Every structure is written in C-alpha cells, then in structure tokens.
From a paper:
Subsequently, the structures of MilA‒CMP, MilA‒dCMP and MilA‒hmCMP complexes were refined to 1.65 Å, 2.10 Å and 1.80 Å resolution, respectively. The electron density for residues 305–308 was poor in the structure of apo MilA but resolved clearly in the structures of all the MilA‒substrate complexes.
Numbering used by the authors:
A (entry chain B): 5 to 232, 240 to 329
B (entry chain A): 5 to 232, 239 to 329
Write the structure that this text describes.
C-alpha cells in the first residue's frame, strides 16, 4: 500500500530492477520480470510522476485518457502525442489492442457500451461486485502475428463507504514506461466516473500478470532510480459536456487550425480544471508546429503541469 | 505465499471473518468483505481441503473440473453433484456465467477455443505474456436481472524455467464455498495443461477484487476456523485428453445410472490409476445418489485424500 502512484511506481521499479524473478524475451524483447505483482494507492488523484529524470509527459497522459473517452481507435490523434506508437499499428491509421476507447464504449464482443452498464449497475445496486469493464477480447489470440494485443484484461469499480474504488487487472505491464500512462488513465477514468456518480474517490488497486523492465530501457531506468505539489481534482458532476468541448479544441489545436493566447484560454467557457487541459494542448501545439512559447500560458497552469512541461521541453518551457 | 491451498484458504478465511474491511449486501446478500485479496501457492497440485468440519466434496471438485473440460453448459451434469447450483439457472436447463466450459472452449465472442489458442501461443513463443483465457463477457451486464454473471475474469498461463505458472483473475470470490472449487478447478486446468505441454508445475496466483464470506455461511465458517496429511496425487504425464474423454463417458453413464461397476471392475478398467480413481469416485457417488449398495472395497483402494473426503461427506455410506 502506498499513498501516491509515484511511491508505488518507484518501489516496483526497484523490485524488478534488483530482484527480477526471471530474465527472458517474450516476442524477442529481452526483459527483467516479476509475476503477479500489484499495489494499492490510497489517493488515486495523485497519479503523476514528478521525478525529473523520468520526464513524465502530462500532455500525453491527458491525451491518452481523452482518446479513450472519445471511443476512438484512430492513430492520428494519439501518435501526435506519442510518435513511437505507430509501431503497433498494422494499417497505419488505427490501433487495435492499444485502443481502449472502443473496448470501453463499444466493445467488439457485442458492440457494448460497458461504461453505461457499469453506471447503471452501480446505480441499481451500490454494493455490486459486478461493475466490470472488460478490455481484452478472446479473438485477439486467434490470428497469428498480431502486433497489438490488449494487455489490460478488465477495470472494476466498487462503491465502498460512499467512495468509488477502482481495480485494474492486466496480463502484462511495462513497469517503466507504460505503467505511468496506464495508471494515469485508469485512475483518471475512476475519478471521472466518481464525479459522474456524485461520489468521493476511494482506493485504486493495480494487479498485473507480468510486470517488466525491458533491457532497452535499463539505462534510463537506472538514471531514474539514481535520482532522488498536488495534482488537481476534477470538478464534481457530469464532465461529459466539458470533455466534448475539450475534444473539439484538441483537434483544432493538433491540426494547427487554431491557436489560443493566455487571455483566450482564460476566456473559454470551461471549468478551470478543463481550461488547463486545453492550455496543455496549446502548449503542445507550440512545440509541434514550432510556434512561440507562451510564458503567460505557463504561469497560469497548476504547478504539477508547469513542472512536467519544463522538464519535458526545457527549451520551450524551462 | 503458501505451500498448499489449505494453508492459504484457512489464512484468508480467518482474515475476512475476524478482520473484514467492509460489511455490505450486494444483490441483498449480507457479507463480510475484503477488497484486492490474493495468494500464491508454491504447490498447486496440493489443491484440496481436508479439514473435517468443512466437509469438502472431492467428487464435486473433480466433476466441476471435468464439466469445464467437456465444454458443457448443461445443468443436469453439475447439479447432480451440487444440487444448490440450480439457483443460478434461469431455464432449469443450462448455466451461463457459472459455466466456464463454453467460455474456455467456445467463447461467446466468436466461438473461439481459447485453450487451443493458448497452447499454440506458448508453443510458438514459450516466454509469451499473451497466453490468456478470457472468461467474462461484456454482454452479461446487458442482460436484465441476470442471475448468473461470470465472476472469473480470466486465467493466464506462463512458461517460466520449464514450469507452467497459473494466474486466476476474479472480480469476486466466495472465500468459504466458491474458493474451494474455483482454486481446485483452476489448478487442475493448470496441471492438465502442464502435462499436455510436457512441463512441470509452477506457482499458482489467485487474485480477486471482492473476497467475502456470506453471513448465511458465518456459522459454518466459524466451525471450520475452530476445528483448525496425506498428499493429493499427481495427474499422469503427457496428453490426458483421451483419458478425460473416457472418464466423461463413464461420468455420464454412472450419473444417469445407465451403468455400474464393482471395485474389481473399477480396478480392471483400461485407464491410468489416477483416472481409475476418479471413475471410482463417480461410482461411489452413484451408490449414494441412486440408493445402491456401498462398495467398501472400492473405498479401500482409493488414495487416502479421497477416502477421507468420502468418509466425512457420507459417513453413513463410507464412514
Ligand atoms: N497500455 C499498454 N501498456 C503496456 O504496458 N504495454 C506494453 O506492451 C507490451 C505488449 O507486448 P505483449 O503483447 O507481448 O505483452 C506489454 O507486455 C506491455 O509491456 C502496451 C500497452 C498498449 O500500448
Ligand atoms: N465459480 C464461482 N465462484 C464464486 O465464488 N461464486 C460466488 O457467487 C457470487 C455471484 O454473485 P455476484 O454476480 O453478485 O458477484 C460471487 O460474488 C461469488 O461469491 C460464484 C461462482 C459461479 O457460480
């Protein structure tokens, strides 16, 4: 049990690095591995990694989470934030097991909106043990040479003592890279669902069949291990309308069809929390489309976001 | 980490009974509960509970595991061994989320045989992290007033250092009743698959979202904790499918009382000893359920673990 994700993250990293149960190479990828590893987070909202050596990218974090909420399988959206992700796209325009959006909101086994069913289930029976969103699909193993098989099995939500608790079940997780965005996204969905239901946030449990550090990340992992402000709360109630507007801005900014000044960002008809997210996308637009870094944009952000930007793009925001 | 399932079972039962995290009533069923609970078993073949006050039923345990291997959703098969399982059947004919057989061998999503796909995946890439059998299905929550939603999410197998390791992921598990048969069946599947692949048996990991004791079982759970050996036999090496097919033939004939076998007939069956003993369990159960003469010579030839289970479960017949 840990207070924040960062504590759990570093502890797990040091477990796998120092005492791997196995060294092997699934699909030719040499790794240090532990089996059946998990942890419990007391404050899932504190979901960010702030160790400068890790250079955690809060823009990608929100982008992935919102990509999931959009229900999209499209590569163009997500690869703009994570260029290496195209390696998992067979067709060069969609992602398959990597795209959790369709798994949540239109699962290929029946075309089911599981999020809605979870909400209904917990509304009809608050104590329910059945409120599960399945991610993995039985057909992913049926075809050979599949380059993108879902590594998350399911996400479960439970209301306990008036608080929404979350559990992520994974068959496999990159403990150094992927875990950072996976735990961010799962706890983001947990918080989002809690606000929708009018509940407080409980604990988050993470459990994984194979947790591993790829040997190709060993140097960077070592640098993070040698190294050594609060994440803001999402506003109460139904955030879908705000998410819809944020997604409109995301696309306009990503395609460089529009740009927002510090004053224009503050003028947006959005809660402060979501204004800052759009601000992250404007900052990312400045990077990607080589536009002038706005220091006034930077100064208005929550400190956690300022730090992430300054460390990730020090030439722009340092 | 525990050596045997009994050690893990008793430790967990004590945790939930005496130190529950929550008290609630999902679907109106008052319970003591802990969230995010699991264990590791170093010796998954030792999968049985022998505490007399628990009255663990080894015949049901094998019947459930074989019911799964048969790929069947039929109620008639399984309710013969566990009459109370009828409560989860909406049609009096089949089970839905309780029936893991079809989920494994012809999953609702595509009709996929996931066991075959797991074996192929591990054959092509021994180190694979992908060898998962999905159990749960997204349509189960879309069924209005569903009385039988799968509580197992998935089973995963990994080949590590020449051993097959197993992981059972469940959204919910009854710590008193269900856990006994679930861990039996999952470790049975694990062993069966290891033998088929020519591997030794690795660790078994059990991971559960909600682990609970129902208040209706509190008195019995207390008797077990207040009350608190011989080894469980190993399944033969190699491909056991042919033996399983033969055992399922005998299972059907004995259950329907369409056949019966004496102790000497059982001993002379053309099966490995391990599987002969399982057929004998079914013959013993037939004697009980169809009111035939108990064969004490049958009882005497069984492994001690099975003798004990029969003696405690049916003391009037085998005590
Ligand atoms: N969300 C994810 N988390 C992750 O940790 N991964 C990583 O990508 C790997 C996919 O390779 P396998 O299908 O061989 O497990 C996982 O083992 C895991 O290390 C991938 C995704 C999907 O992009
Ligand atoms: N294999 C099983 N193990 C189990 O432990 N169960 C128990 O049956 C309950 C089913 O009710 P829910 O769908 O409300 O979780 C589970 O919570 C669990 O307590 C049921 C089955 C299938 O009949």
């Amino acid at each position: 049990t840990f207070g924040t994700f960062q504590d759990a993250y570093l502890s797990q990293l040091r477990d796998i690095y120092h005492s791997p149960e196995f060294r092997n190479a699934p699909r030719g990828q040499a790794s240090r591995e532990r089996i059946g590893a998990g942890f419990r987070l007391l404050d899932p909202v504190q979901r960010h990694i702030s160790v400068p050596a890790r250079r955690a990218n809060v823009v990608f974090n929100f982008a992935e989470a919102l990509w999931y909420l959009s229900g999209s399988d499209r590569l163009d959206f997500i690869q703009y934030y994570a260029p290496g992700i195209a390696a998992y796209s067979a067709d060069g325009r969609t992602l398959r097991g990597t795209a959790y959006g369709p798994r949540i909101f239109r699962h290929p086994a029946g075309g089911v909106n599981q999020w809605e069913n979870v909400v209904k289930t917990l509304t009809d029976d608050p104590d329910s043990k059945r409120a599960v969103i399945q991610i993995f699909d039985p057909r992913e193993l049926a075809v050979a040479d599949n380059i993108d098989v879902a590594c998350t099995l399911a996400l479960q939500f439970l209301i306990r003592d008036g608080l929404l608790c979350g559990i992520g079940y994974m068959r496999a997780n990159d403990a150094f890279r992927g875990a950072v965005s996976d735990v961010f996204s799962f706890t983001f969905l947990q918080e989002f669902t809690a606000r929708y239901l009018g509940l407080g946030i409980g604990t988050y449990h993470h459990v994984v069949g194979s947790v591993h550090i790829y040997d190709s990340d060993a140097r960077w992992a070592e640098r993070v291990l040698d190294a050594a402000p609060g994440f803001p709360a999402m506003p109460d109630g139904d955030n879908w309308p705000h998410v819809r507007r944020v997604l409109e801005w995301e696309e306009r900014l990503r395609t460089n069809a529009a740009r927002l000044s510090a004053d224009a960002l503050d003028a947006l008809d959005l809660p402060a929390y979501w204004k800052h997210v759009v601000a992250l996308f404007e900052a990312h637009r400045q990077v990607r489309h080589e536009d002038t870094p706005d220091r006034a944009l930077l100064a208005a952000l929550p400190e956690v976001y300022r730090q992430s930007l300054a460390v990730k793009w020090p030439g722009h925001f340092g």
